[PDB]
Amino acid sequence: RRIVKLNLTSTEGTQEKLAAAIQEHVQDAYRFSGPTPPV
Amino acid sequence: DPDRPHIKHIYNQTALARNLRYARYGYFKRDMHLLDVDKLVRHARLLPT
Amino acid sequence: PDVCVVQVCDHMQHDQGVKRHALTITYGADGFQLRSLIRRVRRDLERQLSSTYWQCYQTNER
Amino acid sequence: VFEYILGFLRTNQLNLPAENLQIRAEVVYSMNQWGLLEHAFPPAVVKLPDVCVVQVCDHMQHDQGVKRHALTITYGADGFQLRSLIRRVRRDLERQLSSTYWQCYQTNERAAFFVTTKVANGTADLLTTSVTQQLVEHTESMGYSLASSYVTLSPDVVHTSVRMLIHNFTFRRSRRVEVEPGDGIALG
Amino acid sequence: SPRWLRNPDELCVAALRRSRDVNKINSYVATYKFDDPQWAPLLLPEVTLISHNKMIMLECMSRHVNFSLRHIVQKGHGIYLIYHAQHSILQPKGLVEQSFVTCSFGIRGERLRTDIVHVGPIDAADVMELQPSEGHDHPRCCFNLYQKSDVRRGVIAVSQVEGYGTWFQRKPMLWQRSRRIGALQSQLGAFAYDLVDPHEVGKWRDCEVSLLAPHMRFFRNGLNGAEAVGIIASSQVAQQRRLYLGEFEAPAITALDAVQQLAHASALRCKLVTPVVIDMETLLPLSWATRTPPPYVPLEADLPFKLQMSRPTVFAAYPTGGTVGSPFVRGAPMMMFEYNMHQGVDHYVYDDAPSARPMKWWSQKSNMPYSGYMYFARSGLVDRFTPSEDIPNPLPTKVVQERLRKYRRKQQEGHKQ
Amino acid sequence: RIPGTTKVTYTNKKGRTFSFSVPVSELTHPQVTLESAAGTWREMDTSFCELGDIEDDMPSPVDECLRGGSSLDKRLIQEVRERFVSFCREYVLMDTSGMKSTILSTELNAGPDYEHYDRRLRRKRHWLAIRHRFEDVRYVIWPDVVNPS
Amino acid sequence: TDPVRRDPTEFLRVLRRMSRTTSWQKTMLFASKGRMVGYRLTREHYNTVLFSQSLWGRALEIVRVVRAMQEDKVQPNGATYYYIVNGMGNADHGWNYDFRINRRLEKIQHWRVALEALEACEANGFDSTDTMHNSALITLVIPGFNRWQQASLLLQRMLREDRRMHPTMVKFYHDCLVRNNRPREASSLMRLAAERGVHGYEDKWEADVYKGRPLDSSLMLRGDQRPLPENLQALLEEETTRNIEAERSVPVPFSAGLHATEINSVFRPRVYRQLWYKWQHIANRYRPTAALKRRQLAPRDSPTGIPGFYRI
Numbered sequence A: 001r002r003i004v005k006l007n008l009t010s011t012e013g014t015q016e017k018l019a020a021a022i023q024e025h026v027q028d029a030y031r032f033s034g035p036t037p038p039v
Numbered sequence B: 001d002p003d004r005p006h007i008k009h010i011y012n013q014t015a016l017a018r019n020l021r022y023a024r025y026g027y028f029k030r031d032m033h034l035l036d037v038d039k040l041v042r043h044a045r046l047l048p049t
Numbered sequence C: 001p002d003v004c005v006v007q008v009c010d011h012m013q014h015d016q017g018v019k020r021h022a023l024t025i026t027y028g029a030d031g032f033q034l035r036s037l038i039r040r041v042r043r044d045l046e047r048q049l050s051s052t053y054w055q056c057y058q059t060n061e062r
Numbered sequence D: 001v002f003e004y005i006l007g008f009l010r011t012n013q014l015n016l017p018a019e020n021l022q023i024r025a026e027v028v029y030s031m032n033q034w035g036l037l038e039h040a041f042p043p044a045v046v047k048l049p050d051v052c053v054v055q056v057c058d059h060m061q062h063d064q065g066v067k068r069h070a071l072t073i074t075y076g077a078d079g080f081q082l083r084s085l086i087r088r089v090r091r092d093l094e095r096q097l098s099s100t101y102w103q104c105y106q107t108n109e110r111a112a113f114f115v116t117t118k119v120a121n122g123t124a125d126l127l128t129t130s131v132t133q134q135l136v137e138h139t140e141s142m143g144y145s146l147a148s149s150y151v152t153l154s155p156d157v158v159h160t161s162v163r164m165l166i167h168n169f170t171f172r173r174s175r176r177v178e179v180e181p182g183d184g185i186a187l188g
Numbered sequence E: 001s002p003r004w005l006r007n008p009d010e011l012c013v014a015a016l017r018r019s020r021d022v023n024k025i026n027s028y029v030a031t032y033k034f035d036d037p038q039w040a041p042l043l044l045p046e047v048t049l050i051s052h053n054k055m056i057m058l059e060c061m062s063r064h065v066n067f068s069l070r071h072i073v074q075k076g077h078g079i080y081l082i083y084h085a086q087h088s089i090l091q092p093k094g095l096v097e098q099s100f101v102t103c104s105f106g107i108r109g110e111r112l113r114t115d116i117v118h119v120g121p122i123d124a125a126d127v128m129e130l131q132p133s134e135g136h137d138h139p140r141c142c143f144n145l146y147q148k149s150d151v152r153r154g155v156i157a158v159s160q161v162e163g164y165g166t167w168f169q170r171k172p173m174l175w176q177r178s179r180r181i182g183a184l185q186s187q188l189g190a191f192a193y194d195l196v197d198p199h200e201v202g203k204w205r206d207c208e209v210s211l212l213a214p215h216m217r218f219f220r221n222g223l224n225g226a227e228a229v230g231i232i233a234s235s236q237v238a239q240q241r242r243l244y245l246g247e248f249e250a251p252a253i254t255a256l257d258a259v260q261q262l263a264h265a266s267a268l269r270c271k272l273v274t275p276v277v278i279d280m281e282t283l284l285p286l287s288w289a290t291r292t293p294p295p296y297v298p299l300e301a302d303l304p305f306k307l308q309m310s311r312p313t314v315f316a317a318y319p320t321g322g323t324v325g326s327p328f329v330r331g332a333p334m335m336m337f338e339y340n341m342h343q344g345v346d347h348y349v350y351d352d353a354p355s356a357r358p359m360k361w362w363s364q365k366s367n368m369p370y371s372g373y374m375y376f377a378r379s380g381l382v383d384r385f386t387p388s389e390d391i392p393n394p395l396p397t398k399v400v401q402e403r404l405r406k407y408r409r410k411q412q413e414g415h416k417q
Numbered sequence F: 001r002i003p004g005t006t007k008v009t010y011t012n013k014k015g016r017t018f019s020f021s022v023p024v025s026e027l028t029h030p031q032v033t034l035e036s037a038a039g040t041w042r043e044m045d046t047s048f049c050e051l052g053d054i055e056d057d058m059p060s061p062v063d064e065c066l067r068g069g070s071s072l073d074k075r076l077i078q079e080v081r082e083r084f085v086s087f088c089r090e091y092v093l094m095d096t097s098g099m100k101s102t103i104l105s106t107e108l109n110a111g112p113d114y115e116h117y118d119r120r121l122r123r124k125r126h127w128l129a130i131r132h133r134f135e136d137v138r139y140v141i142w143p144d145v146v147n148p149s
Numbered sequence G: 001t002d003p004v005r006r007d008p009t010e011f012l013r014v015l016r017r018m019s020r021t022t023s024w025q026k027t028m029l030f031a032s033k034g035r036m037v038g039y040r041l042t043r044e045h046y047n048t049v050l051f052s053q054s055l056w057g058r059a060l061e062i063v064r065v066v067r068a069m070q071e072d073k074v075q076p077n078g079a080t081y082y083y084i085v086n087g088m089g090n091a092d093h094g095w096n097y098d099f100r101i102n103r104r105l106e107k108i109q110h111w112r113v114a115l116e117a118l119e120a121c122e123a124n125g126f127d128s129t130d131t132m133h134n135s136a137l138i139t140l141v142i143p144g145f146n147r148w149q150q151a152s153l154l155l156q157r158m159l160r161e162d163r164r165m166h167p168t169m170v171k172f173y174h175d176c177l178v179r180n181n182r183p184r185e186a187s188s189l190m191r192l193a194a195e196r197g198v199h200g201y202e203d204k205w206e207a208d209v210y211k212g213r214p215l216d217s218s219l220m221l222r223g224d225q226r227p228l229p230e231n232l233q234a235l236l237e238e239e240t241t242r243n244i245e246a247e248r249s250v251p252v253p254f255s256a257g258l259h260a261t262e263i264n265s266v267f268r269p270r271v272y273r274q275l276w277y278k279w280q281h282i283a284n285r286y287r288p289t290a291a292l293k294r295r296q297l298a299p300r301d302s303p304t305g306i307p308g309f310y311r312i
């Protein structure tokens, strides 16, 4: 269902692109939780 | 990866999973410091002069 | 004083399933050095737990 | 005081009196100022405190109207042999617990734990009494004496139906018949 | 001993003195806090077992002078932010005693332009007194700042800055920044955090180097420009006694240090300065300009940033202009660097669905904390050139009679009662 | 058993030394609660587990025999030989009912799906493991010609 | 991106919620991808993950979490060993009709993984749990696996340590011994369970027919029997071993080389049928599907709110 995107990145930008993609996946996982609301 | 895709057909036109619009250049503008310009020229759709 | 009274009141609360409690120690007299007790408790609890989950200071004298 | 000092001179054995700290410190001061204490007492690891506060807190929940027990034992200071205490407790309980299953173990330094499934009233009372009995025996075997105690029996802050009865014991270290640190204030 | 964190509230300047001349109301004299050992290293040149560096203190002095003067343009505005710092040194050698500040509205009636002229010794060697009572193997040095007649003085530098004194815009500065730090923290895993050897980078110690070697790329051996990913680590700053840090942000001095550093590296690659392969030849800045375009977000310190430079143009009509910002010296060759740095993640998006507006909320932009240009000179040719142009050096009876008359009356009347 | 008491030598103000008596006890539990990496705690061996990791090899008992030890042991030689023979028999008489090897595009940048490890990856991994372990074991089982094990 | 959501506190909070409520793949995915995108994971993160992996009996996921822990140099704390052993104890196993369930479990050697977890906990100095030891023994004697010589030694260590036997452990080990043709050990186990009073086994005490017999060096005689002349006794024992092996060799039809103890022997953990964690159920086969009826839970043409029930 998620639209498949095209990866247009150099041999070098793949590290950062992977980081961003996994961060987006972590946000999609955060959707699991409910609405969000000393030292 | 448009050059060696790990899926049969890269695109599709089902009602909710349309993805041809997201091949536009404007969406790859967000990520330009990482971009591969030849692959962009080859696989981007509404590409300016 | 030749006799001292120490009151330790532990107030237990809980909201939305997270339970907390606050201890209040009070001495009857003033001559006691309570910064030293606070120091000792900090030293003895930094090992048992992180400071993110507890906090001890001095509200005022004694 | 001179009775103790002269007896030590005549027998080459000094036993400081524990109950009367006044006479004990008087003897220590006299012997230090007379320089005879160095002949009386010639020349990871943790120190045992002088006062120890321990407690047994057990949560008694309901499974089918009959209750199951989750009991824990906690000390206030490190250095007390919880593993030995738990071996002793299990050896005691193996004859008395008729529950389907129960286990006990040392959960961390200065703390131990015991879970038993769905005991009846008589068995629960036979459990707690023996747990406290072994706790007191073990702590006193270290050189302590129960100065004070108290009991409480209250519900849980979160769940009303959960009942917890806590025994809180306070022990005073029976000072040994020897010169000990902290007692050095007595000597000049 | 260290104060590697410094709240923005405190400044490095003592109380300023307005001039009494009617036409010099805008003119103030600034005396800097040399007494405090905290500001002593920042307000005095570093001594090498001398470096001639000025951007460590010139920028700090100018910025804090403008911060002090902010009140006459703040008008009670919520926030005050400085920018467009231009500096041109007339004499690379010599330290500074004081400065003269002339303030105006600039162009807009919502900003405050300043003009700082620094006056002090034009030769630090004369004031230097080596090894005074060394005691321990490392002596403590002291400078004689105010000297009667043993020191020859003159203008050493001229700078100009301007503060905007505006409000706190919630959108560009609260919840877009809130998202950008989070995105940078998530991106933190993409980079390799390996430092670089300071010998080929211009610094002496490995404790004051913030430039990741694996992420330093050069085009045609640096002949067309360069890029480098760096991190102003709190660990690096704490055990480094020169620069400090804020609560979250990184000051302009600790942002421009990385620019100077990457410039030194690119100069080595371009064959502009002699490498170490001995003494180190650290190119020094003569004149530099640094601006921050809107939104005037500060440079976050704990998160990485990517710096980018232009090819060095070696000057044997300056491209910038003749005003403050371009060098005011002529002689030995110089090296020009245009630099821009990005602090943010522009490539992260979260397209939950076309129906909503994912781009208006989860889109963002790699901001430009500091942009500008720098002119550098080789450390060996510091004494080769001389200042080009000439700038001049900025250098009760009736009341007493009335008061004595009043006292006459008072003491005369005191008797009658 | 714990000793209970320890002695410490103390010198008074005058300068004479005597013995105190400190009550002490030893620690019995690890102080693991601190989030510190000492580097001394024992770890669990997991090299024997067979995952779907393509960048690894199917672990075999011959792998656990060839531990870089003194191979010049007759009994170890028969053990290695029998384990290798069993591994080869296991490959040859493998039950290949549901096994399928059809080029599937989805598995380009990954191995056969986790749910399809047995039907698609198992036999290929077993063959590669046999070849690799052969490269290690052949000179042990059939040593070159110059009493024999 | 939303610092409230990008907080280590919030990450740990949602991880705890995922472990508490939902299945194991959720915690696996979240922990792995958070770890990749920064988010230093700590021992309580790994414990939260291991809780759900053990609850659902995922041996492979337990192994991967373990490898992640030794990769990150995070020390286990007794609860980790508890969860590792108990989650290896209740892995999916067994046989449907001619169809082995979790045939992949063989090459993992989750039995050795559990044994090494016990070894490491004892070596590092934690107090192992009687349920840990029980779950290890079930792990050894699980229906698809036959390691009874190993399980006997482990049980002997348990008894010398004065630990309790679990009725589930007794059931599994007795079935394994019967499958492996060990009446001596099975009968001794039954007597031991009857004497120790394990609740399921208190009428299962049976006489010892091997009294005064050796374990390792012959022929058993009733007392009213005499050994034949040795030159003839050798011929008889030669004939008897041949006859026993001839009878053993013939294949039994309408089986699958499966012993009766492992025919119709599907096991899935406790959670698989509308139930949740409990400390005393170490290896708890999912309850029979007959417990709940649809028309008893909700009227016709209405959902019963128990998806997945009634499914093997």
Ligand SMILES: CC(=O)SCCNC(=O)CCNC(=O)[C@H](O)C(C)(C)COP(=O)(O)OP(=O)(O)OC[C@H]1O[C@@H](n2cnc3c(N)ncnc32)[C@H](O)[C@@H]1OP(=O)(O)O
Residues within 6 Å of the ligand: F114, F115, F118, G025, G026, G028, G029, G031, G032, G033, G035, G064, G065, G068, G069, G092, G100, G101, G102, G103, G104
């Ligand atoms: C044939 C039979 O009978 S099988 C019977 C049992 N199995 C079944 O019935 C089928 C069930 N199938 C499944 O559950 C899915 O296929 C599964 C197993 C892939 C779900 O697992 P996932 O949610 O995808 O976990 P994840 O996405 O993190 O993948 C694991 C990766 O995380 C990595 N990882 C690193 N650290 C960790 C960590 N702390 N925790 C988890 N994973 C980690 C692993 O190295 C592994 O690397 P990989 O990508 O090369 O594989």
